[PDB]
Amino acid sequence: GPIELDLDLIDEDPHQPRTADNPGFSPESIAEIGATIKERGVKSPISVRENQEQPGRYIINHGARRYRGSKWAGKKSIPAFIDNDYNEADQVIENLQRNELTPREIADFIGRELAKGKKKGDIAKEIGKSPAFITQHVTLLDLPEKIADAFNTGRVRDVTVVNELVTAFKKRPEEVEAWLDDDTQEITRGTVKLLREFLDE
Amino acid sequence: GPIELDLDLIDEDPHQPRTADNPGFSPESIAEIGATIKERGVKSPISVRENQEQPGRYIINHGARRYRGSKWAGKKSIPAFIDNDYNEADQVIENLQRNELTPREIADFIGRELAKGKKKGDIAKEIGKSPAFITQHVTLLDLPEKIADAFNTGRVRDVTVVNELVTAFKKRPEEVEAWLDDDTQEITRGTVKLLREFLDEK
Ligand SMILES: Nc1ccn([C@@H]2O[C@H](COP(=O)(O)OP(=O)(O)OP(=O)(O)O)[C@@H](O)[C@H]2O)c(=O)n1
Ligand SMILES: Nc1ccn([C@@H]2O[C@H](COP(=O)(O)OP(=O)(O)OP(=O)(O)O)[C@@H](O)[C@H]2O)c(=O)n1
Ligand SMILES: [Cl-]
Ligand SMILES: [Cl-]
Ligand SMILES: [Cl-]
Ligand SMILES: [Cl-]
Ligand SMILES: [Cl-]
Ligand SMILES: [Cl-]
Ligand SMILES: [Cl-]
Ligand SMILES: [Cl-]
Ligand number nearest to the C-alpha of A18: 2
In the DSSP assignment, the letter for residue A14 is T
The secondary element (H helix, E strand) that includes residue A126 is helix A120-127
Residues with CB under 6 A from ligand 2: A 16, 18, 24, 33, 36-37, 40, 42-44, 62-66, 95; B 93-94, 97-99
Strand partners, A81: A47
In the DSSP assignment, the letter for residue B57 is -
Phi then psi for residue B95, to 5 deg, are: -100, -40
Residue A178 has, within 13 A of its CA and on its CB side, a CA count of 6
Nearest one of A2, A5, A3, A1 to A76, comparing CA atoms: A5
Quote the CA–CA distance of A30 and A34 in Å, as a whole number.
6
**Cα torsion through A129, A134, A137, A138, rounded to 10:** 160
Phi then psi for residue B7, to 5 deg, are: -60, -30
Are residues B56 and B36 both part of a single domain? yes
Residue A190 has, within 13 A of its CA and on its CB side, a CA count of 12
SS3 A118: coil
Strand pairing category for B3-6 and B46-50: unpaired
A29 and A65 Cβ atoms separated by less than 8 Å = yes
Q: Render A73-112 in DSSP notation, one character per residue.
A: TT-SEEEEEE-SS--HHHHHHHHHS--PPPHHHHHHHHHH
Distance B74 CA to ligand 8 centre (A): 8
The secondary element (H helix, E strand) that includes residue B130 is none
- What radius of gyration do chain B's Cα atoms show? 22
Instruction: Name the residue among B33, B43, B62 with its Cβ closest to that of A86.
Output: B43
Are residues B107 and B194 both part of a single domain? yes
Are residues B66 and B115 both part of a single domain? no
CA B87 and chain centroid, separation: 26
Q: Render B65-123 in DSSP notation, one character per residue.
A: HHHHHHHHTT-SEEEEEE-SS--HHHHHHHHHS--PPPHHHHHHHHHHHHHTT--HHHH
Are residues A109 and A58 both part of a single domain? no
Are residues B69 and B54 both part of a single domain? yes
Are residues B115 and B149 both part of a single domain? yes
CA dist list (Å): A173 to A178, A191, B114, B162: 9, 17, 55, 37
SS3 A5: strand
Quote the CA–CA distance of B61 and B59 in Å, as a whole number.
6
Among A64, A96, A128, the domain boundary falls at: A96
Quote the CA–CA distance of B71 and B99 in Å, as a whole number.
27
Distance B19 CA to ligand 5 centre (A): 14
Number of domains in chain B: 2
Nearest one of B132, B130, B128 to B65, comparing CA atoms: B128
CA dist list (Å): A163 to A88, A168, A196, B112: 40, 9, 12, 41
Among B96, B115, B148, the domain boundary falls at: B96
Resolution, in Å, please?
2.3
Among B96, B127, B153, the domain boundary falls at: B96
Strand pairing category for A46-50 and A3-6: unpaired
B139 and B108 Cβ atoms separated by less than 8 Å = no
Alpha-carbon torsion (B160, B29, A108, A128), positive or negative: negative
Q: Give me the amino acid identity at B144.
A: P
Give yes or no for A89 touching B (CB within 8 A).
yes
Contact residues on chain A for B48, CB-CB shorter than 8 A:
none
Residues making up chain A, counted from first to last: 201
Q: Render A139-191 in DSSP notation, one character per residue.
A: GGGG--HHHHHHHHTTS---HHHHHHHHHHHHH-HHHHHHHHT-SS----HHH
Give yes or no for A17 touching B (CB within 8 A).
yes
Are residues B136 and B72 both part of a single domain? no
Give yes or no for B105 touching A (CB within 8 A).
yes
Strand pairing category for A58-62 and B10-11: unpaired
Which residues are CB-neighbours of B170 under 8 A, at least 6 positions away?
Answer: none
Instruction: Name the residue among B43, B47, B108 with its Cβ closest to that of A90.
Output: B43
Are residues B39 and B121 both part of a single domain? no
CATH, residue A38: 3.90.1530.10
Quote the CA–CA distance of A75 and A41 in Å, as a whole number.
9
Give the range of the structural domain holding residue B118, as residue numbers without chain letter.
103-199
A49, with CB counted inside 10 A (0-12, 13-18, 19+), is middle
Nearest one of B6, B88, B63, B73 to B41, comparing CA atoms: B73
CA dist list (Å): A113 to A14, A142, B59, B87, B122: 41, 15, 22, 13, 46
Nearest one of B18, B2, B129 to B64, comparing CA atoms: B18
Are residues B108 and B91 both part of a single domain? no
SS3 A38: helix
Q: Do B99 and A22 touch (CB under 8 A)?
A: yes
Phi then psi for residue B45, to 5 deg, are: -55, 145
Quote the CA–CA distance of A100 and A88 in Å, as a whole number.
23
Q: Do B93 and A19 touch (CB under 8 A)?
A: no
CATH, residue B115: 1.10.10.730
Quote the CA–CA distance of A198 and B85 in Å, as a whole number.
53
Nearest one of A158, A163, A167 to A188, comparing CA atoms: A158
Residue A40 has, within 13 A of its CA and on its CB side, a CA count of 27
Q: Render B139-181 in DSSP notation, one character per residue.
A: GGGG--HHHHHHHHTTS---HHHHHHHHHHHHH-HHHHHHHHT
CB atoms within 10 A of CB A53: 7
B43 and B118 Cβ atoms separated by less than 8 Å = no
